[PDB]
Scaffold this active site. Structure first.
Site, PDB file in Angstrom:
ATOM      1  N   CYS A 223       0.909  -1.253  -0.081  1.00  0.00           N
ATOM      2  CA  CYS A 223      -0.085   0.131  -0.049  1.00  0.00           C
ATOM      3  C   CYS A 223       0.989   1.070   0.006  1.00  0.00           C
ATOM      4  O   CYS A 223       1.779   1.420  -0.875  1.00  0.00           O
ATOM      5  CB  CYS A 223      -1.052  -0.162   1.252  1.00  0.00           C
ATOM      6  SG  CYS A 223      -0.236  -0.402   2.683  1.00  0.00           S
ATOM      7  N   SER A 224       0.688   1.989   1.013  1.00  0.00           N
ATOM      8  CA  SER A 224       1.831   3.183   1.097  1.00  0.00           C
ATOM      9  C   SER A 224       2.937   2.682   2.070  1.00  0.00           C
ATOM     10  O   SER A 224       4.049   2.602   1.429  1.00  0.00           O
ATOM     11  CB  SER A 224       1.223   4.461   1.486  1.00  0.00           C
ATOM     12  OG  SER A 224       2.026   5.461   1.620  1.00  0.00           O
ATOM     13  N   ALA A 225       2.842   2.586   3.399  1.00  0.00           N
ATOM     14  CA  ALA A 225       3.651   2.259   4.078  1.00  0.00           C
ATOM     15  C   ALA A 225       3.818   0.615   4.211  1.00  0.00           C
ATOM     16  O   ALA A 225       4.998   0.174   4.308  1.00  0.00           O
ATOM     17  CB  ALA A 225       3.464   2.616   5.665  1.00  0.00           C
ATOM     18  N   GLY A 226       3.074  -0.061   3.509  1.00  0.00           N
ATOM     19  CA  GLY A 226       2.981  -1.602   3.517  1.00  0.00           C
ATOM     20  C   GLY A 226       2.875  -2.477   5.210  1.00  0.00           C
ATOM     21  O   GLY A 226       3.220  -3.174   4.992  1.00  0.00           O
ATOM     22  N   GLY A 228      -0.540  -1.224   6.990  1.00  0.00           N
ATOM     23  CA  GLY A 228      -2.149  -1.197   7.430  1.00  0.00           C
ATOM     24  C   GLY A 228      -2.918  -1.921   6.562  1.00  0.00           C
ATOM     25  O   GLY A 228      -3.286  -3.081   6.804  1.00  0.00           O
ATOM     26  N   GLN A 267      -2.698  -1.536  11.066  1.00  0.00           N
ATOM     27  CA  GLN A 267      -2.174  -0.552  11.782  1.00  0.00           C
ATOM     28  C   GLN A 267      -3.033  -0.020  12.609  1.00  0.00           C
ATOM     29  O   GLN A 267      -2.632   0.673  13.547  1.00  0.00           O
ATOM     30  CB  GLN A 267      -1.675   0.313  10.609  1.00  0.00           C
ATOM     31  CG  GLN A 267      -0.847   1.514  11.469  1.00  0.00           C
ATOM     32  CD  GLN A 267      -0.295   2.347  10.295  1.00  0.00           C
ATOM     33  OE1 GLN A 267       1.082   3.129  10.844  1.00  0.00           O
ATOM     34  NE2 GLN A 267      -0.496   2.631   9.274  1.00  0.00           N
TER      35      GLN A 267
END
Length: 285
Positions: A223-226, A228, A267
Site C-alpha cells: 500500500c503506502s507504508a506496506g 495497514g 495498523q
C-alpha cells in the site's frame, strides 16, 4: 488457538458489545505483542538506506527482511536493502512479501526483487496520491515499455472493474528470460478510515488470491507504508483460506504471529474491526 466458525461468529457480537470494548482490548494486545522481543532493523536504520524508506518510522525487521542480491562494485554493501519483509500465510511460510509503495529511487530495487523472488502477482491497495498526500510513485508503464535497471516492463492488458483494476505485464531481464506479472490494483479504498462495505474488498481478495499459481514466488502486497491495508489484506486472505480448509478462525493469534515479521501490520483498530466485518460477510455469503 483457533476457534470454530460458529464460535467466531458469536465472538464478533461480543467484541462489538459494550461500545466495542472487546475490539479495543484485542487491538491493544496486538499493539503490545512484540514489545519485549528486542526485534532489530539495523539495515533499515543505516544512513545509507535512509532514502530507501518512505516513512522514517516504518522499518523492515532484520530477521524477515527480503534481501536483494548484492551488486558488485562501489556501495555494494547496502545494495542488498529494500523496505520489505516476508510474511507467512495460512499454512505457508513466506506466502507474501509485504512492502511499501516504491519510491522513484527504489523502482530498480523493486523490480529486481520481483525478478529475484519469482513473484508473479502484485497486490496494490492504494492510489498514487490520496487527499493531497503522495502515497506511492508510479512504478509501472502507463503504456508501452519502461526500463528499470535490467528489467524491462511491458504493459499487455488493463481490465477495469468498479473497485479495482488488473494490469498484466510482461517483464524481461536484459541479463538473462521473460515472465508474466499481474498487478491487482484496488482503487476505491477511502482516503480516511476503512471501506464502508466489505463486499468489494472480499471480491478483490478472492480474485487476487485465486491468481496465485502453484510453484511460484511469494505474492507481493503493498500500500503506502506496506503495513495497514497490506496487513489487512494478508489477514483476510489467510483467514478465508483457514475457514475453507478447517472451518476454524484465528484472527488474533495469526495477527500476533505476523507482527513478529513486520511492524504495525494491521495498523489501526478500525482495520482490525474491518477484518472481522469482512470475514463475517464471507461466512454468511
Amino acid at each position: 488457538e483457533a476457534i470454530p466458525v460458529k464460535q467466531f461468529v458469536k465472538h464478533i457480537g461480543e467484541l462489538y458489545s459494550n461500545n466495542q470494548h472487546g475490539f479495543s482490548e484485542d487491538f491493544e494486545e496486538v499493539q503490545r505483542c512484540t514489545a519485549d522481543m528486542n526485534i532489530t532493523a539495523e539495515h533499515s536504520n543505516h544512513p545509507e538506506n535512509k532514502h530507501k524508506n518512505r516513512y522514517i518510522n516504518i522499518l523492515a525487521y532484520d530477521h524477515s527482511r527480503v534481501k536483494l542480491r548484492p551488486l558488485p562494485g562501489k556501495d555494494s554493501k547496502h545494495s542488498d536493502y529494500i523496505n520489505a519483509n516476508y510474511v507467512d500465510g495460512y499454512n505457508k511460510a513466506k506466502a507474501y512479501i509485504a512492502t511499501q509503495g516504491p519510491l522513484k529511487s527504489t523502482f530498480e530495487d523493486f523490480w529486481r526483487m520481483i525478478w529475484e523472488q519469482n513473484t508473479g502477482i502484485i497486490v496494490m491497495i492504494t492510489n498514487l496520491v490520496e487527499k493531497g498526500r503522495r502515497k506511492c510513485d508510479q512504478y509501472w508503464p502507463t503504456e508501452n515499455s519502461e526500463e528499470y535497471g535490467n528489467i524491462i516492463v511491458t504493459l499487455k492488458s488493463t481490465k477495469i472493474h468498479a473497485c479495482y483494476t488488473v494490469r498484466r505485464f510482461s517483464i524481461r531481464n536484459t541479463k538473462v528470460n521473460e515472465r508474466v506479472v499481474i498487478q491487482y490494483h484496488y482503487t476505491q479504498w477511502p482516503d480516511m478510515g476503512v471501506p464502508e462495505y466489505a463486499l468489494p474488498v472480499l471480491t478483490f481478495v478472492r480474485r487476487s488470491s485465486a491468481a496465485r499459481m502453484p510453484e511460484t514466488g511469494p505474492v507481493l502486497v503493498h500500500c503506502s507504508a506496506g503495513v495497514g491495508r497490506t496487513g489487512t489484506y494478508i489477514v483476510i486472505d489467510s483467514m478465508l483460506q483457514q475457514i475453507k480448509d478447517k472451518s476454524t478462525v484465528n484472527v488474533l493469534g495469526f495477527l500476533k504471529h505476523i507482527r513478529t515479521q513486520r511492524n504495525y501490520l494491521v495498523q489501526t483498530e478500525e482495520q482490525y474491526i474491518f477484518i472481522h466485518d469482512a470475514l463475517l460477510e464471507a461466512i454468511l455469503g
